[PDB]
Amino acid sequence: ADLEDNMETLNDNLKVIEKADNAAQVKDALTKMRAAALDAQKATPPKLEDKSPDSPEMWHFRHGFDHLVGHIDDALKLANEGKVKEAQAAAEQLKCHCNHCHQHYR
Amino acid sequence: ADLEDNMETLNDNLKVIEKADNAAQVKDALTKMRAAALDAQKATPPKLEDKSPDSPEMWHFRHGFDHLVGHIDDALKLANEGKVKEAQAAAEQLKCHCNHCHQHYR
Ligand code: HEC
Ligand code: HEC
Ligand code: NI
Ligand code: NI
To answer: Domain range for residue A9?
Structure first.
């Protein structure tokens, strides 16, 4: 899968969490988002095609996925503790990670 | 100034930027936010006072301020180009930084 695929996965599953018909859908969507984020971390975005992999730009791009995965993991822990409403609330705050990275590089 | 006063400065000047309609107003407000963020950047909040300075929690807290300052700087550059509405949109996206740090550390 490529970066566009990964972003579709992130977009669809963030919306699944927002609209989940049952609690179990939340964990399943978070799990798919985590994998999409780690896959996306291994891509080069079109607007950074000219930059070194050691550029401050590519460093900040990769770091955004590490930080997103950390907060996905926090939400997964809540869902695995049965606190699925709290997990859904945490997932809502993941949109800030999307908006931040996009502001830089989308 | 102390942490409470720096946080009030950040709070109020976000609204100043929202209320504004010209570049000078937005620039002045962002410059005050930058100074408040930098004033609060280096201290340890009394909740992490027993944590090591290189501990993961202090590292993430310090990065919160470093990253906030970076995006204030970017918003300032837009204001200095006369791009009032782009600077206002960038300032509104700063709320993600405020909420991220608060949810971790407050
Ligand atoms: C950087 C660390 C990112 C994070 C975190 C998220 N996204 Fe992203 N996204 C990023 C880039 C560089 C791009 C441009 C990709 C391109 O090839 O042009 C995108 C794009 C999207 C898109 C549009 C995809 C397309 O087919 O053009 C969507 C729908 C999208 N991103 C969604 C999305 C969501 C919901 C995120 C949070 C959960 C998210 N992204 C994080 C970089 C980064
Ligand atoms: C960490 C890296 C933070 C960032 C980024 C922002 N804030 Fe914050 N804020 C932080 C702490 C640790 C505290 C509590 C300090 C204490 O001793 O209690 C706060 C508090 C506030 C407050 C309330 C002030 C009070 O006396 O309770 C406000 C109104 C506030 N913060 C606003 C704010 C805004 C608007 C921010 C982004 C622009 C922001 N903070 C960032 C830690 C951190
Ligand atoms: Ni975090
Ligand atoms: Ni950034």
So the answer is: 1-106
> How was this one solved?
X-ray
- Reported resolution in A? 1.7
* Residue B104 in contact with partner chain A when CB distance is under 8 A: no
Q: What is the number of other CB atoms lying within 10 angstroms of the CB of residue A65?
A: 22
User: Does B3 sit in the ligand 2 pocket, CB within 6 Å?
Assistant: yes
Q: How many domains does chain B have?
A: 1
Amino acid letter for position A45: P
Q: Which two tokens stand for residue B67?
A: 């990253």
Q: Is A13 in the pocket of ligand 1 (CB under 6 A)?
A: no
- The answer to whether A11 contacts chain B (CB < 8 Å) is no
Kindly state the greatest CA–CA separation across chain A: 45
Nearest-angstrom CA–CA distance, A94 and A69: 10
